[PDB]
Amino acid sequence: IVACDDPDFLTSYFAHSRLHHLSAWKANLKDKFLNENIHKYTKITDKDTYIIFHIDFDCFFATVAYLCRSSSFSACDFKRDPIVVCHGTKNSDIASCNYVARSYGIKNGMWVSQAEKMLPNGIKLISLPYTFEQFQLKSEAFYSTLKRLNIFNLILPISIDEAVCVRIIPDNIHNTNTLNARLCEEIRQEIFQGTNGCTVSIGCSDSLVLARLALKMAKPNGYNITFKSNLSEEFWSSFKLDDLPGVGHSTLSRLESTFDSPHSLNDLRKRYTLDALKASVGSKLGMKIHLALQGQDDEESLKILYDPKEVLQRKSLSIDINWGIRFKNITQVDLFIERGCQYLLEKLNEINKTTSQITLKLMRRCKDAPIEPPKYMGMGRCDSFSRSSRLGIPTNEFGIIATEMKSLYRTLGCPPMELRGLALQFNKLVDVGPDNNQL
DNA sequence: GGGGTGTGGTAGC
DNA sequence: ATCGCTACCACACCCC
Ligand SMILES: [Mg+2]
Ligand SMILES: [N+]
């Protein structure tokens, strides 16, 4: 065990945090896309009629953790047993579960304790450990396979296990469902072979949003082709409201109240007016949902096809540590902030940039919340606080940045013992050019 | 028209 | 035990 005041805490937490892995993996995939395309210009123009293939592993962590399980899980059966991937036993997140487990109602993000309560007596939950390096290896096979197929004009990384693949269709070619289904089965089989046993599902359509919905329809271990001209009540009746891209629990609640608790996209589709939509959830999100309910992408979503080099360019840099934060005095808080800045400046130097504005955010124990929350080392119920500084001259100097960060902390007046989480951000990044002569 | 701030929601497993 | 990250958009509200 390494406590938050140990010099090794950042390294050990990040080594264990699957959420840190997700964001870090997505950041390298973006960087890699940019480097592989420094001189290629493989982007989508208005001249292009395109097909979107949205590809995603099925229960990625659970699958890979199963396939690479240790000897003590040899007789474990991925098709018959309910499997979760998780660190602990009680208030530990279920990062991923297999479709057996989901058939009992278990869902990603549940705590293990919760999921156990849903099995019938005699059914035992299998808990596999994370296999992070293997998660990465299987992801590499994924993207390598996607490129080797030579069937896509643009391959966009969404995550470690997810990509949006664009195929341009010449006007002198008449695309058919049968060609599409066959591409889908090629991709599925090749990736199965290439990952030594992982399965992906695929949504295939003439919009991002439709391909996203098709993909959830395809799961598990299948594919679905639904083009705009195929839309139907049966399609929209298949989806819950937060199946819409951009609709999370909070948008959901607003939508449910405004619209009499729709229970499907078909329900919502028949009940809404764009203007009451905008009123309920906001103008831009409201227009995005309205567009989506026609199978259509909005302008914001289209940018990634039109100028992917720009969309995928990293614009800010930060760390968030809201677990294991237990400091007894301000000297230990200041040292942790210094370690944090050191870590960020390393990342910032890899990408050869400076920062001109930084932010510190913190979580503070709510006055009525227990000192030790239900989740071991959790942040629990907190109030958040944030404050930022413009630096003026962009910099990568530890002295300037760490000093300002610590000052930003003092500004927020959170007693060390009340502190439960910290975020350190470089919000505005500045390129470093060969000319550094300034007076 | 331009700018700024802090806060909040979402996405991946 | 247990590892509740991180980038980005949007918004509400403030200024000249
Ligand atoms: Mg959603
Ligand atoms: N999963």
CATH topology of domain A60-132: MutS, DNA mismatch repair protein, domain I (3.40.1170)
For the segment(s) A8-18+311-431, the CATH number from 3.20.20.140, 3.40.50.150, 3.30.1490.100, 1.20.1250.20 is: 3.30.1490.100
β-strand pairing of A223-225 with A200-205: parallel
Q: Is A321 touching ligand 2 by the criterion CB < 6 Å?
A: no
List protein-proximal bases of chain C (any atom < 7 A from a CB): 1-12
For residues A74 and A207, give the distance between their C-alpha atoms in angstroms, rounded to a whole number.
42
Distances (CA, A) of A413 to A89, A394, A416: 36, 27, 9
Is A101 annotated in some ligand binding site?
yes
CA-to-C1' span, A250 to B8 (A): 10
**Residue A96, number of CB atoms within 10 A of its CB:** 26
At a CB cut-off of 8 Å and minimum separation 6, what does A311 contact?
A303, A304
User: Residue A390, class by beta-carbon neighbours within 10 Å (0-12 exposed, 13-18 middle, 19+ buried)?
Assistant: exposed
CA-to-C1' span, A335 to C16 (A): 40
Phi, psi (5° rounding) for residue A126?
Answer: -95, 125
Please report the resolution in angstroms: 2.0
Contact indicator for A358, A401 with CB cutoff of 8 Å: yes
**What residue type is A217 in one-letter code?**
M
In the CATH hierarchy, which top-level class contains the domain A236-306? mainly alpha
Q: Which of A289, A287, A285, A281 is nearest to A253 (CA)?
A: A281
Q: Which of A298, A404, A286 is nearest to A356 (CA)?
A: A404
Is A366 annotated in some ligand binding site?
no
User: Which technique was used to obtain these atomic coordinates?
Assistant: X-ray
